[PDB]
Amino acid sequence: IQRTPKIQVYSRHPAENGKSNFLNCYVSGFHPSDIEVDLLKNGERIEKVEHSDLSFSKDWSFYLLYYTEFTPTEKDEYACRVNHVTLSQPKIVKWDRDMDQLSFRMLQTSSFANHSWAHSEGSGWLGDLQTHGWDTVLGTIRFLKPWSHGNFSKQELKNLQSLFQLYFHSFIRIVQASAGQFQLEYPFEIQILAGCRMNAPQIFLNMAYQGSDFLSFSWEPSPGAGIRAQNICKVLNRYLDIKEILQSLLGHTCPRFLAGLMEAGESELKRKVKPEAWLSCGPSPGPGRLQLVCHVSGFYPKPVWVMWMRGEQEQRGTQRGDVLPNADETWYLRATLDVAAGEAAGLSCRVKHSSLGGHDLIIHWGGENLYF
Numbered sequence: 001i002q003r004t005p006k007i008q009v010y011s012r013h014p015a016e017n018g019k020s021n022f023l024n025c026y027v028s029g030f031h032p033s034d035i036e037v038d039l040l041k042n043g044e045r046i047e048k049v050e051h052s053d054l055s056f057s058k059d060w061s062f063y064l065l066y067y068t069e070f071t072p073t074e075k076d077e078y079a080c081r082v083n084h085v086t087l088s089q090p091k092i093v094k095w096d097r098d099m100d101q102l103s104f105r106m107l108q109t110s111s112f113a114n115h116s117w118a119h120s121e122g123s124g125w126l127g128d129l130q131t132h133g134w135d136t137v138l139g140t141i142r143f144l145k146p147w148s149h150g151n152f153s154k155q156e157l158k159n160l161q162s163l164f165q166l167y168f169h170s171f172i173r174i175v176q177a178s179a180g181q182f183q184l185e186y187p188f189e190i191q192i193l194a195g196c197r198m199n200a201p202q203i204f205l206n207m208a209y210q211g212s213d214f215l216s217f218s219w220e221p222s223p224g225a226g227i228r229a230q231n232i233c234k235v236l237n238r239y240l241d242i243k244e245i246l247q248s249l250l251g252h253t254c255p256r257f258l259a260g261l262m263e264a265g266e267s268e269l270k271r272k273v274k275p276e277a278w279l280s281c282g283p284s285p286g287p288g289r290l291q292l293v294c295h296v297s298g299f300y301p302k303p304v305w306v307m308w309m310r311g312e313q314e315q316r317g318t319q320r321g322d323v324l325p326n327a328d329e330t331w332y333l334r335a336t337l338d339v340a341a342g343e344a345a346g347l348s349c350r351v352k353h354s355s356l357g358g359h360d361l362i363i364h365w366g367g368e369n370l371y372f
């Protein structure tokens, strides 16, 4: 299945229209991962445009964060331009002042453009935070956070490195072979999400193909997959050695390891960061109609609760848009409530979060203005 991407554009702080900042384009909900993105100054691609390693969500769709530093002027258009097969012309979204899990996850994506070429990325998260990555060239574990070692010995991991290195190297080789037997259509990608967690059961490992639950761990085919999975599971159910290997790795090794990542994290896990919030007038929807927007940002951990107010009286029109990430492993949420200019004054916006601890940030309105 193919899924047209969802460009979302937002800054990290507000513009005072003068002071240096980051811009975020965040692209998600898209398959296949062969994408091109760019950021724009008035028509112009920039350069020191950083982005995170690729990844994918519980529905196999992919997602990314593209960002750069820069300062704003009262002139100066900004926008996020994205091209991707399912699109019929680069859908460029414009920026605006006025807007517009205690489990160790190892995720892999191996893409297969043709017999000649292939490529794979792989990652190693813990809950929301990516703990590890893979060096494809040098064939080795990029550790990422410092405590990403856990209490696994220097030598302990040195081995796993290899046990993956073979794995990764085998995987491409084998599939490329199997390809025709099982009528895998080039180009195609195969995703995998394996790991530890809980506390009943413990293990897991799912393996989509063209963005679709295809195969899972004995080995079971997915109904939707059809005969292909059905077949592909046979070949695999028969290799007991393989079953057993993983059974040991994900069974009791990786959870021992999880235990490890968990206890070694703490100081950065039990970590709290105060938000920051401000105020818009997103586009007036129709006649004498306002649309004040909230802008909580820069907070961690994720769970945040946010309401447009008016004293203690919760305003139930508050719409709560998605939680994007900023680059500094923090969050950003934009809550929005729209009502007639007369209903407008007196409105607050209240931001509950663990980092404040009892003292919810309250943010009132004098348009297009904002305290405290």
Ligand SMILES: *[C@@H]1O[C@H](CO[C@H]2O[C@@H](C)[C@@H](O)[C@@H](O)[C@@H]2O)[C@@H](O)[C@H](O)[C@H]1NC(C)=O
Pocket (backbone or CB within 6 Å): 034, 113, 114, 116, 117
């Ligand atoms: C096999 O595909 C190869 C990879 O093509 C990729 O290159 C990217 C930069 C992108 O633009 C897409 O074209 C692909 O994801 C390529 O090196 C070979 O020419 C292809 N071989 C044949 C025989 O068609």
